[PDB]
Design a protein around this ligand. Structure first.
Ligand SMILES: Cc1cccc(Nc2cccc(Cl)c2-c2ccccc2)c1C(=O)O
Length: 134
């Protein structure tokens, strides 16, 4: 058993708070914010050995990252940022830091009851995205 076991599986978005403001702070333009804000992504998390794969699938975009905990990697985000990413475990929370253009945002995935709760922080702006098993 590993701490990431609690995240493995297929998840669907069930609620979103303050996501438009978060995307604004990140620098997402108007049209992409409107279309991305409508999306109800599925999140698919799998593990093979040390490699964790996270997929986000929606009408807006299909994205996929594969990584090893603590090893920085290149990521092109759904809103087309080219970022440097590192994902680590903090207790049982997956902590994802993205850095680009001297900016930084942090995305934390945690298990709360039967939900997977995502907290996205950019400067002073915090958004919460709640996923349930699909
Ligand atoms: C759980 C999580 C972690 C990291 C990023 C996420 N979404 C986004 C963050 C910034 C900018 C954009 Cl456009 C998106 C986005 C919106 C709609 C569909 C796909 C991606 C999410 C999430 O969608 O909940």
């Amino acid at each position: 058993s590993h701490m990431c076991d609690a995240f493995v599986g297929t998840w669907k978005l069930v609620s979103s708070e303050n996501f438009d403001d978060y995307m604004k702070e990140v620098g997402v333009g108007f049209a992409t914010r409107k279309v991305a804000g409508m999306a109800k992504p599925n999140m698919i998390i799998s593990v093979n050995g040390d490699v964790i794969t996270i997929k986000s699938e929606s009408t807006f975009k299909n994205t996929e990252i594969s990584f090893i905990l603590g090893q920085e990697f290149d990521e092109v985000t759904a809103d087309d940022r080219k970022v440097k990413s590192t994902i680590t475990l903090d207790g049982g929370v997956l902590v994802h830091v993205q850095k680009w253009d001297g900016k930084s945002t942090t995305i934390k995935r945690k298990r709360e009851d039967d939900k997977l709760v995502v907290e996205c922080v950019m400067k002073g702006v915090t958004s919460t995205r709640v996923y349930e098993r699909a």
